[PDB]
Ligand binder design. Structure first.
Ligand SMILES: NC(=O)c1ccc[n+]([C@@H]2O[C@H](COP(=O)([O-])OP(=O)(O)OC[C@H]3O[C@@H](n4cnc5c(N)ncnc54)[C@H](OP(=O)(O)O)[C@@H]3O)[C@@H](O)[C@H]2O)c1
Ligand SMILES: O=C(O)COc1ccc(-c2ccccc2)cc1C(=O)NCc1cccc([N+](=O)[O-])c1
Length: 314
């Protein structure tokens, strides 16, 4: 139920996602998650709910439901904080909100640095994102310092393409390799090339939006729906499981970590009940065959950013 990272720590392969979890609901969601067995929570400063996630974590620690060492808490450095001198403060704000004295894993959220400031998405008057002149290798060195100062146990990356991963791996004077690359992954975006690349370098992959993020705010009614794909429903029926349970088990059997999001107690519990069955080897190849290179998480305003990750094949 845990996977070994290249920092020597073990990471639970199932975690709770928190993007779009409303601040007034996420405390209860995280409490319920911990009660039913979740030990890994995926967070981010940009999700604007870390204070409320932290309330839940703290209550369960205080209640003696779980020990801190058994929890695996992940957060992410937002794009406006890539400048080397801003990284520590960004991490400390997240630690303060989460009410923790360390993170288990801290990720560079996107490879695209944005202009520093209060706004999370600084745009020019024509709607293009305003970049920062930061070198991601300098950002990485700042992340490495967080490990040395004890603020985080592991560091990693998210939404990095293989060339960008390679840039880090080839960084002059590299001190800590990324432990994790967290990327979008599901049957319509199977990511075989990038996953094999990362795994071959000892980097663990976390699959985000495993259900296709049906609540993403930019969703359109005509968009494909994993949860309603009759082929996936058929596999679920064979196992007497839900389609969501199949979608969660799928990345687990590829040696990935997976972080489905819910604020619905029944679904939070349902999503955790994925250790009592196995997809067959043929279920796995068949689910892989559904790849469409359909990506739900990207921003048009970032497509001209020199570090936009999704122009490359992988
Ligand atoms: N690093 C990054 O750039 C990045 C990008 C995207 C996501 N992420 C992380 O990955 C997490 C998961 O991705 P996501 O939030 O995009 O989407 P997701 O986990 O694929 O799907 C979440 C949606 O599915 C619904 N749902 C959950 N369980 C269900 C079930 N058993 N049956 C039916 N519907 C169910 C949720 O509804 P309810 O909540 O209403 O129950 C919500 O609308 C995020 O929350 C975040 O932590 C990271
Ligand atoms: O980033 C996540 O974890 C989930 O997406 C969001 C999650 C949250 C929010 C958010 C929006 C407004 C206020 C606070 C948060 C946005 C977004 C969002 O659009 N993300 C896409 C994105 C981000 C950065 C760079 C690129 N890119 O280079 O293509 C794409």
């Amino acid at each position: 139920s845990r996977i070994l990272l290249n920092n020597g720590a073990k990471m639970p392969i199932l975690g709770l996602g928190t993007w779009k979890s409303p601040p007034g609901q996420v405390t209860e969601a995280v409490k319920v998650a911990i009660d039913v067995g979740y030990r890994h929570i995926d967070c981010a400063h940009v999700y604007q709910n870390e204070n409320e996630v932290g309330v839940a974590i703290q209550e369960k620690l205080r209640e003696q439901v779980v020990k801190r060492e058994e929890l695996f808490i992940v957060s992410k450095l937002w794009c406006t904080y890539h400048e080397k001198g801003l990284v520590k403060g960004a991490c400390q704000k997240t630690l303060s909100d989460l009410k923790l004295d360390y993170l288990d894993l801290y990720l560079i959220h996107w490879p695209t640095g944005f202009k520093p400031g209060k706004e999370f998405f600084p745009l020019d008057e024509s709607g293009n994102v305003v970049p920062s002149d930061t070198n991601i290798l300098d950002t990485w060195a700042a992340m490495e310092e967080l490990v040395d100062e004890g603020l985080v146990k592991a560091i990693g990356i998210s939404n990095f393409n293989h060339l960008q991963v390679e840039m880090i791996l080839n960084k002059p004077g590299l001190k800590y390799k990324p432990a994790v690359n967290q990327i979008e992954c599901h049957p319509y975006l199977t990511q075989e090339k990038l996953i094999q690349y990362c795994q071959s370098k000892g980097i663990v992959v976390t699959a985000y939006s495993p259900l296709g993020s049906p609540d993403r705010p930019w969703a359109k009614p005509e968009d494909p729906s994993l949860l309603e794909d009759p082929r996936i429903k058929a596999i679920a029926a064979k196992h007497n499981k839900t389609t969501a349970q199949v979608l969660i088990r799928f990345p687990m059997q590829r040696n990935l970590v997976v972080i489905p999001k819910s604020v619905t107690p029944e679904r939070i519990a349902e999503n955790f009940k994925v250790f009592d069955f196995e997809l067959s080897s043929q279920d796995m190849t068949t689910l892989l065959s559904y790849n469409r290179n359909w990506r739900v998480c990207a921003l048009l305003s970032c497509t001209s950013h020199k570090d936009y990750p999704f122009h490359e094949e992988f």
